[PDB]
Amino acid sequence: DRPRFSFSIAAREGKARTGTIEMKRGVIRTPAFMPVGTAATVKALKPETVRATGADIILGNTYHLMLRPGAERIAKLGGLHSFMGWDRPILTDSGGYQVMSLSLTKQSEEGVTFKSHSRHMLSPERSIEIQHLLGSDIVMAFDECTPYPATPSRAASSMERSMRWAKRSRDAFDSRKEQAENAALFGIQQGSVFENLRQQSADALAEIGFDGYAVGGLAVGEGQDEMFRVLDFSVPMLPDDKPHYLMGVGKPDDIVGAVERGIDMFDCVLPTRSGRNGQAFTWDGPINIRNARFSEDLKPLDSECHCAVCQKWSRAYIHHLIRAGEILGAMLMTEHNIAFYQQLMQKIRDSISEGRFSQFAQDFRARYFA
Amino acid sequence: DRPRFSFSIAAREGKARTGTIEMKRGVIRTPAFMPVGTAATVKALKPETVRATGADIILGNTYHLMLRPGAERIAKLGGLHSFMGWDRPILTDSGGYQVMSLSLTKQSEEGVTFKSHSRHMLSPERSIEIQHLLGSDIVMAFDECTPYPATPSRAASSMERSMRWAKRSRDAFDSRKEQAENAALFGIQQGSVFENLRQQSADALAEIGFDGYAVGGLAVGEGQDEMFRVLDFSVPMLPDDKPHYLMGVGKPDDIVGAVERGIDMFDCVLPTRSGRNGQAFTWDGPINIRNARFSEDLKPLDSECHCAVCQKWSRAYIHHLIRAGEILGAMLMTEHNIAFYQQLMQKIRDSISEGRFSQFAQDFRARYFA
Ligand SMILES: Nc1nc2cc3nc(NCCc4ccc(CCO)cc4)[nH]c3cc2c(=O)[nH]1
Ligand SMILES: Nc1nc2cc3nc(NCCc4ccc(CCO)cc4)[nH]c3cc2c(=O)[nH]1
Numbered sequence: 001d002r003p004r005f006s007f008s009i010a011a012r013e014g015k016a017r018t019g020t021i022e023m024k025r026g027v028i029r030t031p032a033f034m035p036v037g038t039a040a041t042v043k044a045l046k047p048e049t050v051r052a053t054g055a056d057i058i059l060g061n062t063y064h065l066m067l068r069p070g071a072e073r074i075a076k077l078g079g080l081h082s083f084m085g086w087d088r089p090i091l092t093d094s095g096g097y098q099v100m101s102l103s104l105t106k107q108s109e110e111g112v113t114f115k116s117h118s119r120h121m122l123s124p125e126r127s128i129e130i131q132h133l134l135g136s137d138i139v140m141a142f143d144e145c146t147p148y149p150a151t152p153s154r155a156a157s158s159m160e161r162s163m164r165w166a167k168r169s170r171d172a173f174d175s176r177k178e179q180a181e182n183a184a185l186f187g188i189q190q191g192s193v194f195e196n197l198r199q200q201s202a203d204a205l206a207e208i209g210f211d212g213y214a215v216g217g218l219a220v221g222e223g224q225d226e227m228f229r230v231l232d233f234s235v236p237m238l239p240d241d242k243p244h245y246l247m248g249v250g251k252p253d254d255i256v257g258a259v260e261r262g263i264d265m266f267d268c269v270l271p272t273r274s275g276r277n278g279q280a281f282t283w284d285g286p287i288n289i290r291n292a293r294f295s296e297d298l299k300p301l302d303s304e305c306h307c308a309v310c311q312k313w314s315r316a317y318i319h320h321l322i323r324a325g326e327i328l329g330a331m332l333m334t335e336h337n338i339a340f341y342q343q344l345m346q347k348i349r350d351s352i353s354e355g356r357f358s359q360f361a362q363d364f365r366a367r368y369f370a
Numbered sequence: 371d372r373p374r375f376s377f378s379i380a381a382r383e384g385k386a387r388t389g390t391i392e393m394k395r396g397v398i399r400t401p402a403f404m405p406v407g408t409a410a411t412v413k414a415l416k417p418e419t420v421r422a423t424g425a426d427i428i429l430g431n432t433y434h435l436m437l438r439p440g441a442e443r444i445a446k447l448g449g450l451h452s453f454m455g456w457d458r459p460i461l462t463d464s465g466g467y468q469v470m471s472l473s474l475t476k477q478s479e480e481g482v483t484f485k486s487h488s489r490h491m492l493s494p495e496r497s498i499e500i501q502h503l504l505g506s507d508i509v510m511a512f513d514e515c516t517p518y519p520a521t522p523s524r525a526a527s528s529m530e531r532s533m534r535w536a537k538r539s540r541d542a543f544d545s546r547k548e549q550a551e552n553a554a555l556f557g558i559q560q561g562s563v564f565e566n567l568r569q570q571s572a573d574a575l576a577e578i579g580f581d582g583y584a585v586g587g588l589a590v591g592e593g594q595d596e597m598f599r600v601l602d603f604s605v606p607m608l609p610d611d612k613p614h615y616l617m618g619v620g621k622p623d624d625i626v627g628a629v630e631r632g633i634d635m636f637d638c639v640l641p642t643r644s645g646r647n648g649q650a651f652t653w654d655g656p657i658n659i660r661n662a663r664f665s666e667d668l669k670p671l672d673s674e675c676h677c678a679v680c681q682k683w684s685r686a687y688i689h690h691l692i693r694a695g696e697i698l699g700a701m702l703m704t705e706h707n708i709a710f711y712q713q714l715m716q717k718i719r720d721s722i723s724e725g726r727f728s729q730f731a732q733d734f735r736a737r738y739f740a
């Protein structure tokens with residue numbers, strides 16, 4: 001049987017790595033993209049379709065699920081895996097970001113109280129407990145995603161609180177034997193865009209010790225240049241021998257650049273959400289299928305894509321569906337976009353394994369931005 | 371290779387029949403239920419899923435498709451089958467009903483002019499042409515669905531116009547060699563609830579000659595007792611050796627009773643539309659999955675149903691999805707309901723074949739209405 005958690009690096013090129021995370025519910029190939037399944041569904045896809053695209057792991061959200069249908073309810077029903085019909089690993093975000101994004105809130109050292117978008121509470125202890133009730137495989141520490149921009153003083157105070165919360169998260173996780181034995185716990189680095197704070201945060205997290213390390217506090221409006229600048233110094237601060245997870249990222253070019261900077265895991269609502277809105281990813285860049293120019297275009301969404309959508313339906317048909325507001329339009333766009341993202345990750349993994357990732361990155365960018 | 375059209379009756383019980391329609395694109399088992407795919411999609415289902423439920427044929431709509439994406443456009447793109455990815459037979463309604471249901475309208479002996487829900491025109495000739503452009507396998511005559519209730523005088527005048535239009539439809543269809551050689555044409559009986567008018571309509575249609583005969587002008591608010599009363603005398607008026615198609619029907623009990631009265635084909639938006647709205651069909655009657663009583667119900671939608679939805683997901687999960695407005699909720703409810711309808715048709719076919727349909731009808735009703 002597979003271990004609770006084992007990350008092995010099979011090949012490297014510069015800062016980029018490729019390998020596998022073994023967990024009880026399955027193997028995760030890295031660098032990995034996690035489709036987002038916020039409300040116990042990857043929107044518009046059956047789990048079998050999510051798997052068919054190549055996904056090894058999906059993301060769920062503590063915040064959304066605690067509100068609807070409820071964490072205790074999901075536990076009573078057998079846990080998130082059984083509930084939604086996905087039997088492979090699930091990573092759950094801790095709520096620290098979504099509560100401040102979507103909720104009225106009252107923040108304190110204890111945690112956050114908030115009104116549902118009914119009053120609810122999150123704290124390191126309650127967040128870890130909810131993730132336990134869901135039966136999450138990768139549990140995220142409860143943190144605070146510092147707003148951007150942040151002054152150095154505010155970024156420091158925020159980061160310091162997150163580090164205290166990281167320790168509380170660690171202890172809550174460890175105190176629950178079943179969770180400690182079957183799931184993994186990732187810490188989340190904060191510190192805004194400031195190198196010294198990022199270093200202090202990395203040091204605090206490494207002292208506590210986690211199974212993996214997320215770079216939090218990015219993809220919050222800073223833009224790619226700044227994000228990459230922060231990754232340049234932040235990722236090397238994390239333990240080399242554990243996965244590095246960049247939360248909420250991102251566009252295909254964001255992913256490529258982040259892998260170049262040592263990131264192993266990603267999640268983003270972009271392929272699903274923008275798919276439903278008519279944006280299809282292609283190797284020649286994104287297209288908006290609603291555009292009149294596609295009304296009689298018999299080509300598939302992308303000329304090379306191996307997904308079932310591109311094997312069977314035309315741009316013209318999908319254009320019609322999206323224009324008409326048809327559910328099948330959302331389904332097809334989403335399946336294609338998630339498949340595209342997985343094919344991107346596969347090309348990244350293969351190119352690193354073959355020592356030609358730098359060339360892949362260059363070729364990818366040249367064509368995607370042509 | 372299969373013929374253009376051949377209807378064979380394999381077994382009978384009272385007025386009920388079971389058999390097959392062979393067409394170039396496939397075999398249709400009768401009695402048949404046709405999922406509705408109004409805008410070139412059976413809402414929330416891939417065509418492969420529609421087929422997996424057991425459907426042999428689906429319905430499309432002249433009215434909707436002529437408006438969006440356009441009949442000429444679909445022809446340019448290779449026809450409706452290629453466009454939507456359904457390679458089996460498609461029946462298209464002629465527009466005669468939907469124009470008056472959904473459109474401002476100007477009616478005359480020539481046809482109907484209307485404003486899109488841009489000005490458009492339908493006539494027997496244009497309707498048949500549109501169905502040709504779509505590449506329909508079963509083409510419906512362009513008719514007028516008489517409003518209910520109707521006075522005998524108005525019902526007669528309406529029916530008479532429909533019969534003149536039936537002849538024009540016949541001639542338009544026959545004048546187009548490719549269509550005449552590859553598709554079938556069904557006439558539509560009118561006459562409201564009046565036996566003498568139904569007889570005159572049947573006589574007119576039989577004199578013209580069609581590949582099949584629809585009972586039109588029902589499922590327009592008359593209710594089941596009245597519908598059944600009209601079927602009692604109307605169906606025997608139609609040629610015995612051709613299919614009998616009851617347009618727009620209906621609930622499971624409507625279907626059973628109509629088969630008892632000699633109907634071979636059905637279409638209805640109920641399983642798809644009401645599925646999206648949270649209504650699931652079961653052998654113990656419909657349930658509304660949104661009801662709080664299902665929030666922790668681990669049972670499948672129906673206890674016996676063989677569909678993929680009932681094999682994998684709980685009422686509790688689907689309840690959550692529908693409550694949350696999740697697309698997967700629409701997908702799962704729709705697949706189950708269409709599968710239920712097909713299982714109903716299979717049970718009907720098997721019971722007629724075995725000479726126990728009367729008993730099936732009785733047992734079905736006893737349990738469904740318990
Ligand atoms: N616990 C925790 N979770 C996070 C989630 C995040 N998600 C982001 N970025 C998401 C931004 C994002 C928003 C919308 C769209 C789709 C538009 O069609 C894509 C990306 N940054 C994030 C930071 C954190 C963080 O520090 N801590
Ligand atoms: N050409 C032609 N087409 C028709 C379509 C019809 N469709 C009906 N009934 C449909 C009624 C109907 C409407 C909505 C729902 C779903 C609610 O969730 C179910 C049934 N009667 C009909 C009569 C005719 C007719 O004479 N001629």
Ligand SMILES: [Cl-]
Nearest residue numbers: 043269272273
């Ligand atoms: Cl999404």
Ligand SMILES: [Cl-]
Nearest residue numbers: 413639642643
């Ligand atoms: Cl529908």
Ligand SMILES: [Zn+2]
Nearest residue numbers: 305307310336
């Ligand atoms: Zn594709």
Ligand SMILES: [Zn+2]
Nearest residue numbers: 675677680706
């Ligand atoms: Zn079912």
